[PDB]
Amino acid sequence: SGKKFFVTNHERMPFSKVKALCSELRGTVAIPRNAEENKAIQEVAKTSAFLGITDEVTEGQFMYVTGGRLTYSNWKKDEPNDHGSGEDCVTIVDNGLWNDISCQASHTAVCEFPA
Amino acid sequence: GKKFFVTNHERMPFSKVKALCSELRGTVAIPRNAEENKAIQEVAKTSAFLGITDEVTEGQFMYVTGGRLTYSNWKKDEPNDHGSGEDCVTIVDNGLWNDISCQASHTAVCEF
Ligand SMILES: [Yb+3]
Ligand SMILES: [Yb+3]
Ligand SMILES: [Yb+3]
Ligand SMILES: [Yb+3]
């Protein structure tokens, strides 16, 4: 990526636990700021992983957990869709594409640190 | 939860692994039982350094955090201090352990 490194224990848990874990490590839930970082996160995680982005405050408007409106994005076709009762978290899935999903779902924890 | 962590860094010498885990406020991974041994094996995939060395007294392996070993999984005839010297340990084939040079590049795995 060139600016940060990513860490994982390959454990799957709900978003609030991933956030607590990264805080314990003094890092942040992984956030792809560009295509290279996105591929880097996809590669280290291997399976679906949560990203540090949500639209909990303003529905339809995703923001970084660290603040600011989302710029770079790699949504799957027809996503984000706030499916069913709602989906406010984001996961990186096949091909590194993104899908908004329930924050209560369990996915791979990935934390980022400046390189 | 899963206590062993890996990064997207490439393989590196033991000094760099130690630097990495300390920068992360952790320790180089130490398996203290067969279950933990299998867990490090699975998160690393490729050979990885363990937090065990015989740097202080040749032939006497110790945890980097201190203490004599309570669990070991040495490959038959290991540790053999091959050639100049092998003071570091890697978990390799089928989870077995081999002492190797600390200057060799292997996967970094940290524990917290
Ligand atoms: Yb939403
Ligand atoms: Yb969705
Ligand atoms: Yb040795
Ligand atoms: Yb050896």
Side-chain angles (χ1 to χ4, degrees):
Chain A
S1 299
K3 306 179 194 66
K4 50 178 85 160
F5 67 90
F6 306 99
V7 176
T8 186
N9 62 346
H10 287 105
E11 187 182 354
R12 303 178 291 278
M13 57 193 79
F15 192 71
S16 71
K17 289 189 79 291
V18 174
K19 195 157 184 268
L21 177 54
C22 294
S23 300
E24 285 283 313
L25 291 176
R26 301 197 300 170
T28 294
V29 177
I31 293 171
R33 297 278 174 172
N34 52 65
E36 256 191 25
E37 296 187 347
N38 195 74
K39 297 173 170 60
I41 293 166
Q42 181 193 169
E43 264 86 301
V44 82
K46 282 79 175 77
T47 50
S48 59
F50 277 120
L51 300 182
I53 298 159
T54 82
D55 72 325
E56 283 202 339
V57 179
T58 304
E59 181 53 39
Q61 170 67 69
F62 290 81
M63 311 283 291
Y64 298 112
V65 288
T66 48
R69 295 163 90 126
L70 176 74
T71 55
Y72 170 76
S73 74
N74 194 36
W75 303 109
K76 178 170 288 189
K77 186 176 284 77
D78 295 313
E79 299 301 327
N81 66 348
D82 202 49
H83 199 75
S85 56
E87 297 181 316
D88 305 326
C89 278
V90 181
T91 49
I92 178 169
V93 298
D94 55 298
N95 300 349
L97 294 165
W98 300 4
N99 176 25
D100 64 330
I101 61 147
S102 167
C103 299
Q104 286 75 50
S106 291
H107 296 278
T108 303
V110 184
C111 308
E112 64 174 28
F113 297 85
Chain B
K2 296 184 172 173
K3 315 169 185 174
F4 302 109
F5 295 72
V6 292
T7 70
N8 65 321
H9 280 107
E10 292 181 272
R11 297 171 203 112
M12 57 186 78
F14 191 68
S15 51
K16 291 180 188 176
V17 175
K18 260 196 156 302
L20 177 55
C21 300
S22 68
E23 190 201 327
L24 285 171
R25 262 54 226 217
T27 297
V28 184
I30 292 172
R32 297 185 191 248
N33 57 56
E35 301 71 69
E36 285 181 16
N37 199 68
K38 193 187 191 60
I40 296 168
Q41 188 192 157
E42 298 303 275
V43 80
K45 290 296 180 72
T46 59
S47 62
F49 277 116
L50 297 187
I52 296 162
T53 76
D54 72 327
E55 291 191 303
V56 173
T57 305
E58 182 52 46
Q60 177 68 36
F61 287 78
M62 308 289 285
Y63 297 119
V64 293
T65 49
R68 300 182 180 91
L69 307 188
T70 58
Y71 168 81
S72 67
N73 194 32
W74 297 113
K75 180 176 180 183
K76 187 177 183 168
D77 295 291
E78 294 308 306
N80 69 346
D81 202 53
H82 186 71
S84 39
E86 300 194 309
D87 298 347
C88 275
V89 181
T90 50
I91 179 167
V92 289
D93 314 280
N94 235 290
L96 295 173
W97 299 2
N98 173 31
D99 64 333
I100 71 298
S101 166
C102 293
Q103 301 185 337
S105 286
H106 294 283
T107 299
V109 182
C110 305
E111 68 194 334
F112 298 91

